[PDB]
Amino acid sequence: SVKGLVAVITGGASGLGLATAERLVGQGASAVLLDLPNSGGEAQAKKLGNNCVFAPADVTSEKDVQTALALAKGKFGRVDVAVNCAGIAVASKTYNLKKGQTHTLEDFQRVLDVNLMGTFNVIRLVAGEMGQNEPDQGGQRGVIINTASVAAFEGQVGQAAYSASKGGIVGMTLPIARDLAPIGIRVMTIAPGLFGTPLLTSLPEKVCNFLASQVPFPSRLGDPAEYAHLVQAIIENPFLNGEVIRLDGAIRMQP
Amino acid sequence: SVKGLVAVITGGASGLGLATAERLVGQGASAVLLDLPNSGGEAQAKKLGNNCVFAPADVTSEKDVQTALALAKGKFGRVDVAVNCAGIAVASKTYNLKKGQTHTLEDFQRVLDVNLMGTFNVIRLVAGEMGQNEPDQGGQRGVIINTASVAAFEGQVGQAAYSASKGGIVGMTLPIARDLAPIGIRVMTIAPGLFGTPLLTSLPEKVCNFLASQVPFPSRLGDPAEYAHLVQAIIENPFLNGEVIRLDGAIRMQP
Amino acid sequence: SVKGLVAVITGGASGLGLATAERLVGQGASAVLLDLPNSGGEAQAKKLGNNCVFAPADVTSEKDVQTALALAKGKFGRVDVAVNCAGIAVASKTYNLKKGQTHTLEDFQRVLDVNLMGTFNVIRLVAGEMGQNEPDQGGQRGVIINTASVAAFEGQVGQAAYSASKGGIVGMTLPIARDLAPIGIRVMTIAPGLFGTPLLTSLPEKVCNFLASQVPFPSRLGDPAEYAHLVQAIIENPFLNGEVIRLDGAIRMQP
Amino acid sequence: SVKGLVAVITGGASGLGLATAERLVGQGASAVLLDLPNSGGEAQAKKLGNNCVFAPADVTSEKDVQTALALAKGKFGRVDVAVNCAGIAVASKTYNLKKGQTHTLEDFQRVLDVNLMGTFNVIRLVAGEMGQNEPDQGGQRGVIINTASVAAFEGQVGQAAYSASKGGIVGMTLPIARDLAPIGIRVMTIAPGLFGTPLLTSLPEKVCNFLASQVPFPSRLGDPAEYAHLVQAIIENPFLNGEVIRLDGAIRMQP
Amino acid sequence: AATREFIEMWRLLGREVPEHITEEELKTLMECVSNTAKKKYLKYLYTKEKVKKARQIKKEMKAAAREEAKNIKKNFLFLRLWDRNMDIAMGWKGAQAMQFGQPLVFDMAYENYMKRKELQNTVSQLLESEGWNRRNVDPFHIYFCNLKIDGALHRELVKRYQEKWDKLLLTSTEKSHVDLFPKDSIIYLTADSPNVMTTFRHDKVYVIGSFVDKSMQPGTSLAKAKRLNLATECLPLDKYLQWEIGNKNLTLDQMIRILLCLKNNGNWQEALQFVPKRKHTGFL
RNA sequence: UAAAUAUAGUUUAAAAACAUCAGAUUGUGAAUCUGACAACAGAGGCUUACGACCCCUUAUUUACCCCA
Ligand SMILES: *O[C@H]1[C@@H](O)[C@H](n2cnc3c(=O)[nH]c(N)nc32)O[C@@H]1COP(=O)(O)OP(=O)(O)OP(=O)(O)O
Ligand SMILES: C[S@@+](CC[C@H](N)C(=O)[O-])C[C@H]1O[C@@H](n2cnc3c(N)ncnc32)[C@H](O)[C@@H]1O
């Protein structure tokens, strides 16, 4: 069970992070919402009740994450689960010959920083926090769950930066799992497909509804609650390690 | 929830099948144990209580599976979940130059028949049974879960036949998921690593201890209960479709 | 170089096999065309000249392949390369709810037998033949190249049997590579996508033209000559082993 | 045929880049060696003859790459092939509980910048240069070949940063291939295993010799010449697109 | 030489001498400068050939028993290649250890103080030590320091390891440990150290003296560890064990096994389980 | 100072058992085969021989407290 577990959820003020927080807190876990200061995570933490707190942090910055992790230690005493849900995208083509536009390197950097470098920054710092835990009966100290995308495998046009960052998370899941295996920390990656996240619902109705219809079954956008369910399943199963689980409803992204 | 679901579990008299049956029946599902007549399946069905029955069938035989499926319809009225856990394994080298030994074609055939052709035989026949179900609120009629192995990805020396059969299940998961998507049947594949199945626990203590040590974390053989847990998670999660989940504790099989 | 190599090409009377034979014979290799008696391979062998012979064999039959391999040993004195190109497909849905139409088990068996069991039959028998070779300077005795498909990864609707067989070839590439590594035989798999073979011409003109257009670049059907080129590249490259190369022009099959 | 092609080879002053340059120049291509000013690439360019020039550039810097590409246009008139071979690594564990060591964020950044961000920087800029080419008979303007590693799939302990960067290249191969498919540029990725590169030789001699022995066949370190051969094969083959080819001699990395 | 004829008269007297002596061992008979020393050497060869005979007799007894057994006389997941696969697995761990593992130093600067007898025993002990390190879950990165290339100890190591010597996943160098590591992080282990080892430190390099002094020279390890200003530590044998008989200077194999389980987050009790039981009468 | 005491992988016994090393692609007794290593603290004596008997050195333990 996940009763009495402390989860540090990054990007927990919205989207898949908030869904994870809602479910975990409902199941009797304590959550730390690690999001940007302006993300309105304070309201979400207040909504979830006493067993949820807001830690304002940028995942790219070591100082911010350290302060946030310290807040978790102060409030709840330990960290058991880290869920990396913080993530941005840019939709830019590498090069379009007609109008002669080149993908700006700054946009590529910014996506890498948040998605890849931010995830790693959290991992390396939470591993320290989780290391301080006494092993349970199974010798487990913590679970780290990262969010890639299906873009990591089949990226659409204009998802080069996004695919690179998600490809990096998929790449480094196994090395990190092997790294932390002696300590007793499980590293797992979820690769969501098309979810009803704020980013997707912002898109034009024609585009969203078509993408939903292109999912084999169910022919709808991923409910964030389903992401939360898979997170809980991974936390509960003490033999899931070093694997990427595609939560996409069997969709492959067309060119 | 899995309360009130009817699962047809193939190879359910032992190993990962029995573990799945135990968990599902405990959670208030009905199970049909579909195994060979000579398996101790009747005792297992009697042990599990009223909500479990034994259907003697060879999975390679169409007649046998049809009779078994009919028994499920008779007893429980419907079929909601199919779990394919039936399997055999063979350790033969493709060619041994020193001893002048060639892999027997009959060995290759018989492994393919049970693992690959047996799984497909069940799938195509249960899809008919599941097709007759009224869609739920989400439009789902059934879930089909297949068991591959990590041999499908990293097969050791002497696992050519086994890897071929498990490779086939991994291959055809997505096509079948796309086939059954209109009907509203989810097809999922689990790829277990080293589990405390009867064939592993039979080994010398020194060999078992080595196999346990090979798994990064946890450094133990997979408890079949863990397999059962992942099965339940897949059944409960509406949005898991057309995917292989590696349940291996982050192990890659060395030559 | 492939000058003076003997290639046993399976299904060499047509399609990708014939293309491989044409190229290899042109580069100064000797080829054995291993195809069915009715395949018209005799005309192809006569056309290719003295350095090509026709061996009538069914790949599923051990006796047939043995006789064919013996013919190769008799004529050319050795076997250096085996290319498995023989294959059939059947386009049948797993289950059609509307029509109540179920995939025939016999159809599934027949596809498995030719594609998977036929490939393995050739491999295990040619490994014996290749084993008898004296190692070259690099310790290499032979190269075995198998043909899977992109169906192994992204199978279309109605390609369950085809995907299973191609999944099996992809699965067992690594185990067999590890098996034959002591002997010094390289095992490699090519996964073609949409080639202008007679099989694909057999589709409607509208459908083939659409499939060609769906290839990112180049937006045309795979030229069989390109398959032959990749075969030669694999033979020439000492360090390509235990890998699947997708030759598809960057196409992913949509559901 | 690669006669009269201009290849911009990144990291071409040593390792796999230099091997590629040697082969391509020998086959009648023109090469631009794009490496750091201190890399001693000038000597290599002088050695290779008139058809090879040295362009001092950092791949992370947009200005540097632009100047280097301009040098290529000045000297040779066009760019047909881009080979990305630039690479650094660090061997650092994510977290060492015993030693209380955390992986430095700066180390992670530096590896990502060179491997991932550097590769993308070259791609986006050379795509502009290649875009200016008139299509050949097949509609092809250019080929871009990237170097990942097998670390992208099976990363060892302490390879987290390297695996992340190589994972990113594998991730973004297909999106970029789909991006550039309209303008007829092929994007391909090679994933070398254990090669006789400066990266691998930096390990202890005893560790190198062990890693060599662990390759199934041939049981030796990859000759850089073999990478050059595969590069030429990709350039020659019109239908290789959006794929990662593992050139590893069938090795899978254990932790 | 006269020694060949010399041993003949000793054979007649029946002073526990073996049947035959190889020409190699004749050379070592000349080394002995005393009747008493010769006696101890002949007895060693006497017992050596006796055990060779007994083992052989027990061997062919088993062989004859095995062949008659043969006359009297399925679905597997795995081929039986366990010994092969274990060696590969231990290899992969050894390579990982060489990159990341904690150093542990054997100082080979003691050839001068050892005789031929003690020198073989050191190599025997080193062989066992590396074995326990190899087979461990968390191996030390083993350093052979102050190992001369052409030295007796190097020559003996090469003989026992054969072709495996080159392929061992440990670092052998003629250099000293002070040259390879920071001087502050070197803790020299010796029983003669006033400083007791309180807890195993993962940041420290431990130096173990490759020295089997049957002819006891006390303090030699300490003397080396003082000439170079190194920290010295001794095991808490007095604290945890009720010492009754025997030398407090343990063998190399025992030392490493004590350290290995100390490193692996064991307590001193679990560690001192490797201390010979004949030497103490329980934990206090 | 005096007493016992000293197994260099571990025990037991008055030589074995279990361990160690190298080789092995083992069809699941490899539960094996072929090799390597074999030194009851150390040195020197006596004797027909001995692990007894003498002596020295070092070490351990205990007793003593120093000629109480
Ligand atoms: O002869 C003995 C004795 O007189 C004396 N001694 C030391 N400890 C004790 C003890 O517990 N009880 C008695 N009765 N007598 C004791 O020491 C003499 C031996 O000394 P050595 O000359 O052998 O050695 P020394 O102390 O000179 O050695 P070092 O410390 O200078 O190295
Ligand atoms: C038998 S001792 C060598 C004895 C030598 N006379 C000396 O002064 O160390 C072999 C090695 O094991 C280690 N060792 C043995 N017993 C020890 C103990 N009790 N405490 C610390 N190290 C010990 C030391 O490193 C020593 O060099």
Numbering used by the authors:
A (entry chain B), B (entry chain C), C (entry chain D), D (entry chain A): 7 to 261
E (entry chain F): 92 to 164, 175 to 385
Manuscript excerpt for this entry:
The TRMT10C/SDR5C1 platform in the RNase Z-HCCA complex is similar to the RNase Z-HS and RNase ZH548A-HS complexes, but here, ELAC2 pivots by ~6 degrees around the tRNA. Consequently, the active site is now ~13 Å away from the mt-tRNAHis 3′-end, and the active site channel is occupied by the 3′-CCA tail. The first C (C1CCA) of the 3′-CCA tail is recognized by H-bonding to S726 and S490 and to the backbone carbonyls 490 and 492, which lie at the entrance of the active site channel. The second C (C2CCA) inserts into a pocket in the NTD situated on the opposite side of the active site channel. C2CCA establishes H-bonds with Q92 and T127, which pulls C2CCA toward the bottom of the pocket. Furthermore, the phosphodiester bond between C1CCA and C2CCA is stabilized by K700. The C1CCA–C2CCA bond is the closest to the active site. Nevertheless, it is not well positioned for hydrolysis since it is 1.9 Å further away from the active site than the scissile bond in the mt-tRNAHis-Ser(AGY) complex.
Here, we present several cryo-EM structures of the mitochondrial RNase Z complex (ELAC2/SDR5C1/TRMT10C) bound to different maturation states of mitochondrial tRNAHis, showing the molecular basis for tRNA-substrate selection and catalysis. The human long form of RNase Z, ELAC2, has two alternative start codons to produce a nuclear and a mitochondrially targeted form. SDR5C1 is a moonlighting homotetrameric short-chain dehydrogenase/reductase.
